[PDB]
Amino acid sequence: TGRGLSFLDLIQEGNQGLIRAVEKFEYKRRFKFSTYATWWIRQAINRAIADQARTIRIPVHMVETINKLSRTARQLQQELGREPTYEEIAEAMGPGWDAKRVEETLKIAQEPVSLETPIGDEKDSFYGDFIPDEHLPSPVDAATQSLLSEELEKALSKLSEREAMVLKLRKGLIDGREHTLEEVGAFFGVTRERIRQIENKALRKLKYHESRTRKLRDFLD
Amino acid sequence: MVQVDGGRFATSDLNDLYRRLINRNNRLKKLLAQGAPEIIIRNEKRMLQEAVDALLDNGRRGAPVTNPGSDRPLRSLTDILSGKQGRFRQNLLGKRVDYSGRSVIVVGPQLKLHQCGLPKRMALELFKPFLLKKMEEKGIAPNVKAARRMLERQRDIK
């Protein structure tokens, strides 16, 4: 009990172990059933505890390493009368273990925390209430992206429709993806050198217009 | 399941409840596949029902399911909906809203009945989009973004 699994869960996993024991048992050895059963029961329970109790699942060997690290650290703290540093644990774990390895192991062993954990005396505060959502774009960012699209359409209309469309196909404003010189050249019916040339002059005219009005400078962050 | 500022993960209890459910269920499927006795399958089924119960309404029947090393009941769907902190009362009939603020009150004697003293900075932040717009309307800024970046720092205010 207390190792991260419910009493009944432990019981059921131990039952699975018992079943394994029954199917693998040989009475010819003149051993009582308890002796051979206990091994498989303990094995199944331990496997369950290792494969379950973590919200983010960790491989069983890794869990073994982590628990070994914990026993080591606890021994060291019992001998030293203080919490061991990373270096002391590293030295105590033998060769292959430096401070960085101990730290990375501990870090990788960090369990998640509940979003419903209260921050206060009353029922009012939840931890998750303080967590900003970074995913959905802010109204400001959205409006700035919109004004960007509009200003780019402003500067692309100052070109001829051909060069504007070549630039638009090359940077992928149309379908969202960038075509090569061969594809825009095959679509416009010219050579790749020619399509790259009109892309060059389009971009250059854009550079001139930008050096002139300076509308697109503020969007560069 | 979200990574906070410190590089640590924070997650909802519904995940633990769902995990309980799935684990007990799968264990039941394997226990059935292997033809375990009754008194085993029975126990498993019972624990499955109690798992589903814990998920849908927790602490409703029997003891509430808790996380390891805590006296705190886990938050189930029923809890999420009902209650003063529940979805309805907290997030539906009422909300936290934008373009708002608060401060201490002080009596203006001079105010006409229809007026209120509003601190400058408060008003600036409250009305900010309008201020950007009227800043682009005049020659104070080339565009919106420029005006906003201009208002961001306090020593840039004029």
């Binding site: 009493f7 009944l8 019981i11 | 008194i39 029975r42 126990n43 019972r46 624990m47 109690e50 029997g62």
Partner: peptide, 14 residues
Amino acid sequence: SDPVRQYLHEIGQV
């Protein structure tokens, strides 16, 4: 009521 007690009873049968 208490699932553990119940299971221990059922086990206590055989």
